[PDB]
Amino acid sequence: TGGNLPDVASHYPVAYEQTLDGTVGFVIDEMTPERATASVEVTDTLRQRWGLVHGGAYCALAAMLATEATVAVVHEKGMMAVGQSNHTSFFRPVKEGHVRAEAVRIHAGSTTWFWDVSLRDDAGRLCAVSSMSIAVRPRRD
Amino acid sequence: GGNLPDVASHYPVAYEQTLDGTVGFVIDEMTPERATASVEVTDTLRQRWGLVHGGAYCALAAMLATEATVAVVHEKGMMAVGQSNHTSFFRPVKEGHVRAEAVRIHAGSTTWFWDVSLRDDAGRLCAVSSMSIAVRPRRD
Amino acid sequence: TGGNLPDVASHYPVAYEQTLDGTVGFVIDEMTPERATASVEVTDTLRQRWGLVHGGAYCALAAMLATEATVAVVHEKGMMAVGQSNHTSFFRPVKEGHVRAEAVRIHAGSTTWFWDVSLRDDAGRLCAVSSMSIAVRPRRD
Amino acid sequence: GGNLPDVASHYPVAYEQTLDGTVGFVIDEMTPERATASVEVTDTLRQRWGLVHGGAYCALAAMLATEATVAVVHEKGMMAVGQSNHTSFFRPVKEGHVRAEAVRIHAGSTTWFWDVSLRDDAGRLCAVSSMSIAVRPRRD
Ligand SMILES: CC(C)(COP(=O)(O)OP(=O)(O)OC[C@H]1O[C@@H](n2cnc3c(N)ncnc32)[C@H](O)[C@@H]1OP(=O)(O)O)[C@@H](O)C(=O)NCCC(=O)NCCSCC(=O)c1ccc(O)cc1
Ligand SMILES: CC(C)(COP(=O)(O)OP(=O)(O)OC[C@H]1O[C@@H](n2cnc3c(N)ncnc32)[C@H](O)[C@@H]1OP(=O)(O)O)[C@@H](O)C(=O)NCCC(=O)NCCSCC(=O)c1ccc(O)cc1
Ligand SMILES: CC(C)(COP(=O)(O)OP(=O)(O)OC[C@H]1O[C@@H](n2cnc3c(N)ncnc32)[C@H](O)[C@@H]1OP(=O)(O)O)[C@@H](O)C(=O)NCCC(=O)NCCSCC(=O)c1ccc(O)cc1
Ligand SMILES: CC(C)(COP(=O)(O)OP(=O)(O)OC[C@H]1O[C@@H](n2cnc3c(N)ncnc32)[C@H](O)[C@@H]1OP(=O)(O)O)[C@@H](O)C(=O)NCCC(=O)NCCSCC(=O)c1ccc(O)cc1
């Protein structure tokens, strides 16, 4: 699968290379039911005009990583998972190198899963944290 | 260039190469208390399941709120940056546009706070995103 | 009903005057399905040791007001409503007088309702805002 | 008096009369990077349905995070106050205790950020509450 997203269905409405994710280059490294990690190389496509990594990039990386780590478990159970809320706090700017994300599952309820995502730069500093609440619902189709 | 506020003579990254230029955000109106922006939905704004990406609502809110604060404080020697964002997703968007309206609710000496509503073509509320914006002295 | 909370059941596990709400003195003024208002007189019981209204008081008032405004609609439909998340931002301290809250319903989904609560002082200044997400689930008993 | 940090000679409100003294919060450990507190559940901490009040988790997180920051910055001429709190409720608590553990995750010059886990007697995670704490020069 492109970007290493979990391969859980035969076809997807939008190919990975055309999505926001494939455009900026998000890649999943490890993925388990309780923990997943992903990273992205910073290029201008991830920056805003003042030269820092965009606020939206940290949110998008957290959202994809936490939701897909959820999809990877629940999809075969006949469920979908979508992001329901995201709370992100920005501690230090990233200007270049990579952003690495580590998502840790802190609650798995029957309707809601909750993941804490830490976003670090190449020196290992904590630049942002992003909490994701993921809704889990029976598939429609 | 997106109609972002033109406050400086040079910018490190050109608008068309930024995340904002890549997905196509454009500012429509901008005043100190209220700003609006919009974007057409294309695959670049979607995730693999075909819905507008969670990141895209957050990106829009953050650019709009922060640049609407830049518009006011830059000429005063201040920089403005997003410090936190809280986004809640009520209804997905599949196609058409996403239209954002940011309303300034607090303007403190060190922090401004904006509420950003994000609506689809039918005018339905699809997400809200609160942005807290830190305002600090420019570093020379 | 004590504090003017919606009267939706014959008996409640804890009487109003013994609850956190009745202890600090929260009172509901208006209540509709899309809008509710409440207030509280500030006394030391609502303050922290440095003399300001406690952070917890703004959250508690928002949580009670948004959840009960939800209970008032859904209870007779056989549902319960509980607070699922709360995000509060504090703009200006309140030292005395009253805190008045106005909750406005911004989304009513089939599993989740979302209320924005503004908290003002007696001069009408906006001192805090508190977003409440309320989960709505079938009753257990 | 709750074991709060004793940083000043006089406090405007005595601990037993504060919201914190009224519901019974007590600090157990406090270091610059980590603090713990607990409270017994009584009706005063509950809402009318018999569950611990949403406000009670938020109150606990906010007092603990802020006072753990006071402990460090007060002697440096700074005051600390809660600037935002985000609390998510995973499982209700009906009786027993609520035990809070606050871990400092960022300590910036103007903002500190703490994550506070709130657990019941069985040690289950019932809520988490992130606290952002503004740190500013004391006003004389
Ligand atoms: C928000 C805040 C300024 C608060 O500061 P703090 O908690 O007191 O932390 P502190 O001030 O100790 O600084 C930590 C790092 O902040 C940076 N910083 C702090 N103050 C300043 C300043 N006055 N000038 C420049 N950098 C600063 C600096 O990198 C610092 O490290 P150091 O160089 O001092 O070692 C700091 O945490 C921070 O800079 N966070 C990152 C903000 C960020 O990166 N947000 C996302 C990007 S801007 C939002 C956005 O998406 C956008 C999009 C499009 C668009 O067109 C415009 C904006
Ligand atoms: C979260 C929730 C499911 C909760 O539902 P609710 O608050 O109870 O609202 P309700 O169920 O009344 O539904 C409102 C709308 O949600 C949709 N919805 C609700 N349940 C379902 C379901 N089981 N299946 C499909 N759609 C549903 C539906 O569109 C509905 O409108 P209608 O067609 O029923 O009129 C609904 O609010 C919602 O869908 N919010 C939008 C979720 C969203 O779009 N999040 C962001 C995108 S997914 C996160 C992400 O960024 C990501 C990125 C990359 C990647 O690879 C994976 C994910
Ligand atoms: C957080 C912040 C300091 C950020 O400031 P800002 O966004 O730049 O706004 P600005 O600085 O323009 O000031 C607005 C108001 O803030 C207050 N303020 C701001 N800076 C200061 C300062 N250095 N010293 C004293 N007051 C200040 C002041 O009242 C101001 O109005 P004015 O007198 O200047 O007209 C300001 O918004 C604020 O004070 N918010 C209220 C904080 C609050 O009330 N939080 C809850 C109480 S403390 C958290 C807690 O629950 C706790 C519980 C138990 C316990 O034992 C300890 C703590
Ligand atoms: C929000 C939610 C219902 C979502 O469920 P989820 O994330 O899918 O988790 P799941 O459904 O797996 O359930 C976990 C636990 O929640 C409880 N729960 C879930 N569904 C139900 C239900 N339909 N009925 C009763 N309890 C339920 C149950 O305790 C469960 O454990 P178990 O007994 O099933 O092992 C669950 O996370 C939860 O209950 N969180 C706690 C809610 C809470 O305690 N909020 C604060 C208090 S209510 C807000 C308030 O402050 C207020 C104040 C004054 C006032 O007058 C009114 C309200």
PDB file of N, CA, C and O in Angstrom, chain A residues 5-6 8 12-14 18-21 23-24 44-45 47-51 54 56 59-60 68 83-90, chain B residues 4-5 7 11-13 17-20 22 43-44 46-50 53 55 58-59 67 70 82-89:
ATOM      1  N   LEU A   5       0.114   2.652   4.436  1.00  0.00           N
ATOM      2  CA  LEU A   5      -1.134   2.651   5.181  1.00  0.00           C
ATOM      3  C   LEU A   5      -1.663   1.211   5.244  1.00  0.00           C
ATOM      4  O   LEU A   5      -1.405   0.397   4.355  1.00  0.00           O
ATOM      5  N   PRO A   6      -2.422   0.893   6.300  1.00  0.00           N
ATOM      6  CA  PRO A   6      -2.900  -0.477   6.425  1.00  0.00           C
ATOM      7  C   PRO A   6      -3.715  -0.927   5.211  1.00  0.00           C
ATOM      8  O   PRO A   6      -4.642  -0.233   4.776  1.00  0.00           O
ATOM      9  N   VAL A   8      -6.537  -2.704   4.036  1.00  0.00           N
ATOM     10  CA  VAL A   8      -7.691  -3.344   4.648  1.00  0.00           C
ATOM     11  C   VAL A   8      -8.852  -3.496   3.670  1.00  0.00           C
ATOM     12  O   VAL A   8      -9.869  -4.094   4.002  1.00  0.00           O
ATOM     13  N   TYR A  12      -9.675   1.782  -2.920  1.00  0.00           N
ATOM     14  CA  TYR A  12      -9.873   2.983  -2.095  1.00  0.00           C
ATOM     15  C   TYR A  12     -10.392   4.082  -3.000  1.00  0.00           C
ATOM     16  O   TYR A  12      -9.988   4.170  -4.146  1.00  0.00           O
ATOM     17  N   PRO A  13     -11.296   4.930  -2.504  1.00  0.00           N
ATOM     18  CA  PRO A  13     -11.724   5.943  -3.458  1.00  0.00           C
ATOM     19  C   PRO A  13     -10.630   6.809  -4.068  1.00  0.00           C
ATOM     20  O   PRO A  13     -10.793   7.182  -5.220  1.00  0.00           O
ATOM     21  N   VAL A  14      -9.524   7.103  -3.378  1.00  0.00           N
ATOM     22  CA  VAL A  14      -8.537   8.033  -3.938  1.00  0.00           C
ATOM     23  C   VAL A  14      -7.182   7.377  -3.760  1.00  0.00           C
ATOM     24  O   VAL A  14      -6.858   6.917  -2.643  1.00  0.00           O
ATOM     25  N   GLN A  18      -2.312  10.764  -4.848  1.00  0.00           N
ATOM     26  CA  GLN A  18      -3.121  11.963  -5.115  1.00  0.00           C
ATOM     27  C   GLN A  18      -3.706  12.638  -3.864  1.00  0.00           C
ATOM     28  O   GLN A  18      -4.303  13.724  -3.975  1.00  0.00           O
ATOM     29  N   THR A  19      -3.655  11.941  -2.725  1.00  0.00           N
ATOM     30  CA  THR A  19      -4.287  12.454  -1.498  1.00  0.00           C
ATOM     31  C   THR A  19      -3.413  13.565  -0.890  1.00  0.00           C
ATOM     32  O   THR A  19      -2.247  13.724  -1.249  1.00  0.00           O
ATOM     33  N   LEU A  20      -3.950  14.317   0.064  1.00  0.00           N
ATOM     34  CA  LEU A  20      -3.090  15.196   0.908  1.00  0.00           C
ATOM     35  C   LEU A  20      -1.892  14.410   1.444  1.00  0.00           C
ATOM     36  O   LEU A  20      -0.761  14.891   1.392  1.00  0.00           O
ATOM     37  N   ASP A  21      -2.122  13.212   1.980  1.00  0.00           N
ATOM     38  CA  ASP A  21      -1.030  12.440   2.571  1.00  0.00           C
ATOM     39  C   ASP A  21       0.104  12.158   1.598  1.00  0.00           C
ATOM     40  O   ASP A  21       1.289  12.279   1.955  1.00  0.00           O
ATOM     41  N   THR A  23       0.625  13.683  -1.206  1.00  0.00           N
ATOM     42  CA  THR A  23       1.192  14.943  -1.686  1.00  0.00           C
ATOM     43  C   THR A  23       2.332  15.437  -0.783  1.00  0.00           C
ATOM     44  O   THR A  23       3.377  15.862  -1.281  1.00  0.00           O
ATOM     45  N   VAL A  24       2.215  15.342   0.545  1.00  0.00           N
ATOM     46  CA  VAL A  24       3.220  15.984   1.360  1.00  0.00           C
ATOM     47  C   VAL A  24       4.236  14.913   1.716  1.00  0.00           C
ATOM     48  O   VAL A  24       5.276  15.218   2.261  1.00  0.00           O
ATOM     49  N   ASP A  44       9.201  22.582   1.146  1.00  0.00           N
ATOM     50  CA  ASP A  44       8.289  23.747   1.156  1.00  0.00           C
ATOM     51  C   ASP A  44       6.786  23.429   1.173  1.00  0.00           C
ATOM     52  O   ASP A  44       5.983  24.253   1.661  1.00  0.00           O
ATOM     53  N   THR A  45       6.398  22.322   0.544  1.00  0.00           N
ATOM     54  CA  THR A  45       5.023  21.843   0.530  1.00  0.00           C
ATOM     55  C   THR A  45       4.431  21.650   1.928  1.00  0.00           C
ATOM     56  O   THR A  45       3.216  21.727   2.100  1.00  0.00           O
ATOM     57  N   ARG A  47       5.507  23.673   4.440  1.00  0.00           N
ATOM     58  CA  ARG A  47       5.811  24.880   5.200  1.00  0.00           C
ATOM     59  C   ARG A  47       4.691  25.887   4.921  1.00  0.00           C
ATOM     60  O   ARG A  47       3.950  25.736   3.949  1.00  0.00           O
ATOM     61  N   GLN A  48       4.631  26.924   5.745  1.00  0.00           N
ATOM     62  CA  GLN A  48       3.841  28.125   5.457  1.00  0.00           C
ATOM     63  C   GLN A  48       4.792  29.230   4.981  1.00  0.00           C
ATOM     64  O   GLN A  48       5.975  28.999   4.894  1.00  0.00           O
ATOM     65  N   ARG A  49       4.276  30.399   4.624  1.00  0.00           N
ATOM     66  CA  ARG A  49       5.109  31.345   3.875  1.00  0.00           C
ATOM     67  C   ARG A  49       6.254  31.938   4.719  1.00  0.00           C
ATOM     68  O   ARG A  49       7.196  32.526   4.169  1.00  0.00           O
ATOM     69  N   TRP A  50       6.221  31.768   6.042  1.00  0.00           N
ATOM     70  CA  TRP A  50       7.244  32.362   6.908  1.00  0.00           C
ATOM     71  C   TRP A  50       8.326  31.336   7.121  1.00  0.00           C
ATOM     72  O   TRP A  50       9.266  31.598   7.851  1.00  0.00           O
ATOM     73  N   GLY A  51       8.205  30.200   6.467  1.00  0.00           N
ATOM     74  CA  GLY A  51       9.311  29.209   6.472  1.00  0.00           C
ATOM     75  C   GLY A  51       9.224  28.127   7.532  1.00  0.00           C
ATOM     76  O   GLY A  51      10.143  27.285   7.631  1.00  0.00           O
ATOM     77  N   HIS A  54       3.894  24.059   8.630  1.00  0.00           N
ATOM     78  CA  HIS A  54       2.517  24.577   8.791  1.00  0.00           C
ATOM     79  C   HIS A  54       1.855  23.903  10.007  1.00  0.00           C
ATOM     80  O   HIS A  54       2.096  22.709  10.223  1.00  0.00           O
ATOM     81  N   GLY A  56      -1.160  23.048  10.126  1.00  0.00           N
ATOM     82  CA  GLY A  56      -2.017  22.004   9.547  1.00  0.00           C
ATOM     83  C   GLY A  56      -1.242  20.700   9.323  1.00  0.00           C
ATOM     84  O   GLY A  56      -1.827  19.629   9.219  1.00  0.00           O
ATOM     85  N   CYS A  59      -1.314  18.670  12.538  1.00  0.00           N
ATOM     86  CA  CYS A  59      -2.637  18.081  12.718  1.00  0.00           C
ATOM     87  C   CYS A  59      -2.940  16.953  11.739  1.00  0.00           C
ATOM     88  O   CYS A  59      -3.664  16.023  12.082  1.00  0.00           O
ATOM     89  N   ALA A  60      -2.520  17.106  10.475  1.00  0.00           N
ATOM     90  CA  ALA A  60      -2.913  16.154   9.403  1.00  0.00           C
ATOM     91  C   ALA A  60      -2.158  14.854   9.701  1.00  0.00           C
ATOM     92  O   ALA A  60      -2.645  13.737   9.517  1.00  0.00           O
ATOM     93  N   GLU A  68      -5.972   5.802  10.991  1.00  0.00           N
ATOM     94  CA  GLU A  68      -5.624   4.586  10.260  1.00  0.00           C
ATOM     95  C   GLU A  68      -5.189   3.482  11.240  1.00  0.00           C
ATOM     96  O   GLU A  68      -5.450   2.300  11.012  1.00  0.00           O
ATOM     97  N   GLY A  83     -11.975  10.670  12.361  1.00  0.00           N
ATOM     98  CA  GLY A  83     -11.585  11.615  13.392  1.00  0.00           C
ATOM     99  C   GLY A  83     -12.778  12.419  13.857  1.00  0.00           C
ATOM    100  O   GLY A  83     -13.552  12.917  13.052  1.00  0.00           O
ATOM    101  N   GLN A  84     -12.970  12.527  15.171  1.00  0.00           N
ATOM    102  CA  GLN A  84     -14.105  13.302  15.696  1.00  0.00           C
ATOM    103  C   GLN A  84     -13.641  14.626  16.312  1.00  0.00           C
ATOM    104  O   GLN A  84     -14.372  15.628  16.293  1.00  0.00           O
ATOM    105  N   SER A  85     -12.469  14.615  16.930  1.00  0.00           N
ATOM    106  CA  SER A  85     -11.881  15.882  17.436  1.00  0.00           C
ATOM    107  C   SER A  85     -10.392  15.805  17.532  1.00  0.00           C
ATOM    108  O   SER A  85      -9.803  14.710  17.605  1.00  0.00           O
ATOM    109  N   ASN A  86      -9.756  16.968  17.450  1.00  0.00           N
ATOM    110  CA  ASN A  86      -8.315  16.956  17.475  1.00  0.00           C
ATOM    111  C   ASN A  86      -7.905  18.164  18.303  1.00  0.00           C
ATOM    112  O   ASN A  86      -8.458  19.257  18.116  1.00  0.00           O
ATOM    113  N   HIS A  87      -6.993  17.984  19.246  1.00  0.00           N
ATOM    114  CA  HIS A  87      -6.522  19.145  20.010  1.00  0.00           C
ATOM    115  C   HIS A  87      -5.019  19.163  19.912  1.00  0.00           C
ATOM    116  O   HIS A  87      -4.364  18.189  20.312  1.00  0.00           O
ATOM    117  N   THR A  88      -4.441  20.213  19.322  1.00  0.00           N
ATOM    118  CA  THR A  88      -3.012  20.226  19.057  1.00  0.00           C
ATOM    119  C   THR A  88      -2.400  21.435  19.753  1.00  0.00           C
ATOM    120  O   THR A  88      -2.974  22.527  19.743  1.00  0.00           O
ATOM    121  N   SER A  89      -1.263  21.232  20.390  1.00  0.00           N
ATOM    122  CA  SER A  89      -0.544  22.368  20.990  1.00  0.00           C
ATOM    123  C   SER A  89       0.864  22.433  20.437  1.00  0.00           C
ATOM    124  O   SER A  89       1.563  21.408  20.389  1.00  0.00           O
ATOM    125  N   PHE A  90       1.311  23.656  20.153  1.00  0.00           N
ATOM    126  CA  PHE A  90       2.545  23.826  19.382  1.00  0.00           C
ATOM    127  C   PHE A  90       3.593  24.448  20.319  1.00  0.00           C
ATOM    128  O   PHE A  90       3.383  25.538  20.862  1.00  0.00           O
TER     129      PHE A  90
ATOM    130  N   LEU B   4      -3.165  36.721   0.856  1.00  0.00           N
ATOM    131  CA  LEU B   4      -2.668  36.897   2.234  1.00  0.00           C
ATOM    132  C   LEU B   4      -2.213  38.340   2.436  1.00  0.00           C
ATOM    133  O   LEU B   4      -1.873  39.050   1.475  1.00  0.00           O
ATOM    134  N   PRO B   5      -2.220  38.805   3.686  1.00  0.00           N
ATOM    135  CA  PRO B   5      -1.875  40.200   3.955  1.00  0.00           C
ATOM    136  C   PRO B   5      -0.443  40.492   3.531  1.00  0.00           C
ATOM    137  O   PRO B   5       0.501  39.727   3.826  1.00  0.00           O
ATOM    138  N   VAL B   7       2.456  42.175   4.242  1.00  0.00           N
ATOM    139  CA  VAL B   7       3.049  42.944   5.332  1.00  0.00           C
ATOM    140  C   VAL B   7       4.565  43.075   5.257  1.00  0.00           C
ATOM    141  O   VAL B   7       5.130  43.796   6.056  1.00  0.00           O
ATOM    142  N   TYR B  11       9.302  36.994   1.609  1.00  0.00           N
ATOM    143  CA  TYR B  11       8.793  35.907   2.463  1.00  0.00           C
ATOM    144  C   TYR B  11       9.703  34.734   2.151  1.00  0.00           C
ATOM    145  O   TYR B  11       9.999  34.514   0.996  1.00  0.00           O
ATOM    146  N   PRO B  12      10.095  33.963   3.157  1.00  0.00           N
ATOM    147  CA  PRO B  12      10.971  32.807   2.942  1.00  0.00           C
ATOM    148  C   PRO B  12      10.392  31.818   1.912  1.00  0.00           C
ATOM    149  O   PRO B  12      11.150  31.251   1.115  1.00  0.00           O
ATOM    150  N   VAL B  13       9.083  31.554   1.922  1.00  0.00           N
ATOM    151  CA  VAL B  13       8.541  30.563   0.969  1.00  0.00           C
ATOM    152  C   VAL B  13       7.502  31.206   0.096  1.00  0.00           C
ATOM    153  O   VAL B  13       6.593  31.900   0.587  1.00  0.00           O
ATOM    154  N   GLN B  17       4.289  27.562  -3.462  1.00  0.00           N
ATOM    155  CA  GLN B  17       5.019  26.360  -3.043  1.00  0.00           C
ATOM    156  C   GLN B  17       4.639  25.953  -1.593  1.00  0.00           C
ATOM    157  O   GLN B  17       5.100  24.930  -1.119  1.00  0.00           O
ATOM    158  N   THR B  18       3.863  26.770  -0.895  1.00  0.00           N
ATOM    159  CA  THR B  18       3.553  26.478   0.518  1.00  0.00           C
ATOM    160  C   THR B  18       2.457  25.418   0.571  1.00  0.00           C
ATOM    161  O   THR B  18       1.865  25.060  -0.455  1.00  0.00           O
ATOM    162  N   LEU B  19       2.135  24.936   1.768  1.00  0.00           N
ATOM    163  CA  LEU B  19       1.085  23.931   1.848  1.00  0.00           C
ATOM    164  C   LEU B  19      -0.153  24.670   1.380  1.00  0.00           C
ATOM    165  O   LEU B  19      -1.016  24.099   0.702  1.00  0.00           O
ATOM    166  N   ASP B  20      -0.258  25.934   1.764  1.00  0.00           N
ATOM    167  CA  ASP B  20      -1.514  26.686   1.492  1.00  0.00           C
ATOM    168  C   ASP B  20      -1.775  26.890  -0.025  1.00  0.00           C
ATOM    169  O   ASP B  20      -2.919  26.819  -0.508  1.00  0.00           O
ATOM    170  N   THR B  22      -0.324  24.987  -2.320  1.00  0.00           N
ATOM    171  CA  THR B  22      -0.524  23.661  -2.878  1.00  0.00           C
ATOM    172  C   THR B  22      -1.963  23.172  -2.852  1.00  0.00           C
ATOM    173  O   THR B  22      -2.423  22.567  -3.822  1.00  0.00           O
ATOM    174  N   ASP B  43      -8.718  16.202  -4.999  1.00  0.00           N
ATOM    175  CA  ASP B  43      -8.059  15.078  -4.344  1.00  0.00           C
ATOM    176  C   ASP B  43      -6.925  15.459  -3.390  1.00  0.00           C
ATOM    177  O   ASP B  43      -6.659  14.728  -2.427  1.00  0.00           O
ATOM    178  N   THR B  44      -6.198  16.530  -3.706  1.00  0.00           N
ATOM    179  CA  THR B  44      -5.133  17.004  -2.873  1.00  0.00           C
ATOM    180  C   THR B  44      -5.628  17.315  -1.452  1.00  0.00           C
ATOM    181  O   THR B  44      -4.811  17.318  -0.540  1.00  0.00           O
ATOM    182  N   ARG B  46      -8.133  15.635  -0.001  1.00  0.00           N
ATOM    183  CA  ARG B  46      -8.837  14.465   0.514  1.00  0.00           C
ATOM    184  C   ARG B  46      -7.892  13.454   1.129  1.00  0.00           C
ATOM    185  O   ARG B  46      -6.705  13.465   0.874  1.00  0.00           O
ATOM    186  N   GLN B  47      -8.464  12.547   1.897  1.00  0.00           N
ATOM    187  CA  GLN B  47      -7.719  11.351   2.283  1.00  0.00           C
ATOM    188  C   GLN B  47      -8.212  10.212   1.372  1.00  0.00           C
ATOM    189  O   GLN B  47      -9.116  10.419   0.557  1.00  0.00           O
ATOM    190  N   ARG B  48      -7.584   9.039   1.488  1.00  0.00           N
ATOM    191  CA  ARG B  48      -7.846   7.871   0.629  1.00  0.00           C
ATOM    192  C   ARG B  48      -9.257   7.337   0.625  1.00  0.00           C
ATOM    193  O   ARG B  48      -9.660   6.666  -0.329  1.00  0.00           O
ATOM    194  N   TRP B  49     -10.013   7.610   1.684  1.00  0.00           N
ATOM    195  CA  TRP B  49     -11.423   7.243   1.727  1.00  0.00           C
ATOM    196  C   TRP B  49     -12.324   8.227   0.979  1.00  0.00           C
ATOM    197  O   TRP B  49     -13.531   8.005   0.952  1.00  0.00           O
ATOM    198  N   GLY B  50     -11.769   9.299   0.414  1.00  0.00           N
ATOM    199  CA  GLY B  50     -12.573  10.258  -0.377  1.00  0.00           C
ATOM    200  C   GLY B  50     -13.201  11.423   0.364  1.00  0.00           C
ATOM    201  O   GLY B  50     -13.949  12.213  -0.219  1.00  0.00           O
ATOM    202  N   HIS B  53      -9.715  15.750   4.188  1.00  0.00           N
ATOM    203  CA  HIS B  53      -8.783  15.369   5.252  1.00  0.00           C
ATOM    204  C   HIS B  53      -8.991  16.243   6.517  1.00  0.00           C
ATOM    205  O   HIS B  53      -9.156  17.465   6.453  1.00  0.00           O
ATOM    206  N   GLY B  55      -6.796  17.161   8.536  1.00  0.00           N
ATOM    207  CA  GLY B  55      -5.736  18.163   8.470  1.00  0.00           C
ATOM    208  C   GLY B  55      -6.074  19.429   7.700  1.00  0.00           C
ATOM    209  O   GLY B  55      -5.515  20.503   7.976  1.00  0.00           O
ATOM    210  N   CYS B  58      -7.978  21.909   9.799  1.00  0.00           N
ATOM    211  CA  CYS B  58      -7.087  22.504  10.758  1.00  0.00           C
ATOM    212  C   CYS B  58      -6.127  23.495  10.086  1.00  0.00           C
ATOM    213  O   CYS B  58      -5.794  24.505  10.691  1.00  0.00           O
ATOM    214  N   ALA B  59      -5.619  23.141   8.903  1.00  0.00           N
ATOM    215  CA  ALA B  59      -4.685  23.980   8.149  1.00  0.00           C
ATOM    216  C   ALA B  59      -5.369  25.296   7.813  1.00  0.00           C
ATOM    217  O   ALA B  59      -4.802  26.398   7.934  1.00  0.00           O
ATOM    218  N   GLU B  67      -3.014  34.591  10.124  1.00  0.00           N
ATOM    219  CA  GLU B  67      -2.628  35.658   9.168  1.00  0.00           C
ATOM    220  C   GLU B  67      -3.551  36.839   9.479  1.00  0.00           C
ATOM    221  O   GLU B  67      -3.170  38.007   9.323  1.00  0.00           O
ATOM    222  N   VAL B  70      -1.507  38.477  12.193  1.00  0.00           N
ATOM    223  CA  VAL B  70      -0.390  39.148  11.493  1.00  0.00           C
ATOM    224  C   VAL B  70      -0.798  40.504  10.880  1.00  0.00           C
ATOM    225  O   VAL B  70      -0.152  41.535  11.084  1.00  0.00           O
ATOM    226  N   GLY B  82       0.508  30.252  15.649  1.00  0.00           N
ATOM    227  CA  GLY B  82      -0.502  29.400  16.315  1.00  0.00           C
ATOM    228  C   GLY B  82       0.086  28.758  17.551  1.00  0.00           C
ATOM    229  O   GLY B  82       1.175  28.154  17.503  1.00  0.00           O
ATOM    230  N   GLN B  83      -0.627  28.814  18.659  1.00  0.00           N
ATOM    231  CA  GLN B  83      -0.125  28.135  19.845  1.00  0.00           C
ATOM    232  C   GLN B  83      -0.951  26.864  20.179  1.00  0.00           C
ATOM    233  O   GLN B  83      -0.403  25.843  20.639  1.00  0.00           O
ATOM    234  N   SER B  84      -2.250  26.909  19.945  1.00  0.00           N
ATOM    235  CA  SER B  84      -3.039  25.653  20.040  1.00  0.00           C
ATOM    236  C   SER B  84      -4.218  25.692  19.095  1.00  0.00           C
ATOM    237  O   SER B  84      -4.710  26.748  18.713  1.00  0.00           O
ATOM    238  N   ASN B  85      -4.732  24.525  18.748  1.00  0.00           N
ATOM    239  CA  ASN B  85      -5.854  24.491  17.828  1.00  0.00           C
ATOM    240  C   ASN B  85      -6.747  23.370  18.354  1.00  0.00           C
ATOM    241  O   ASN B  85      -6.245  22.271  18.664  1.00  0.00           O
ATOM    242  N   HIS B  86      -8.038  23.623  18.452  1.00  0.00           N
ATOM    243  CA  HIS B  86      -8.953  22.524  18.818  1.00  0.00           C
ATOM    244  C   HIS B  86     -10.052  22.397  17.774  1.00  0.00           C
ATOM    245  O   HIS B  86     -10.832  23.337  17.531  1.00  0.00           O
ATOM    246  N   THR B  87     -10.084  21.259  17.099  1.00  0.00           N
ATOM    247  CA  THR B  87     -11.003  21.151  16.003  1.00  0.00           C
ATOM    248  C   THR B  87     -11.960  19.997  16.277  1.00  0.00           C
ATOM    249  O   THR B  87     -11.511  18.918  16.644  1.00  0.00           O
ATOM    250  N   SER B  88     -13.246  20.236  16.048  1.00  0.00           N
ATOM    251  CA  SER B  88     -14.265  19.180  16.214  1.00  0.00           C
ATOM    252  C   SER B  88     -14.958  18.952  14.878  1.00  0.00           C
ATOM    253  O   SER B  88     -15.396  19.930  14.236  1.00  0.00           O
ATOM    254  N   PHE B  89     -15.135  17.688  14.505  1.00  0.00           N
ATOM    255  CA  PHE B  89     -15.598  17.354  13.135  1.00  0.00           C
ATOM    256  C   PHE B  89     -17.037  16.866  13.208  1.00  0.00           C
ATOM    257  O   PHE B  89     -17.286  15.815  13.817  1.00  0.00           O
TER     258      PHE B  89
END
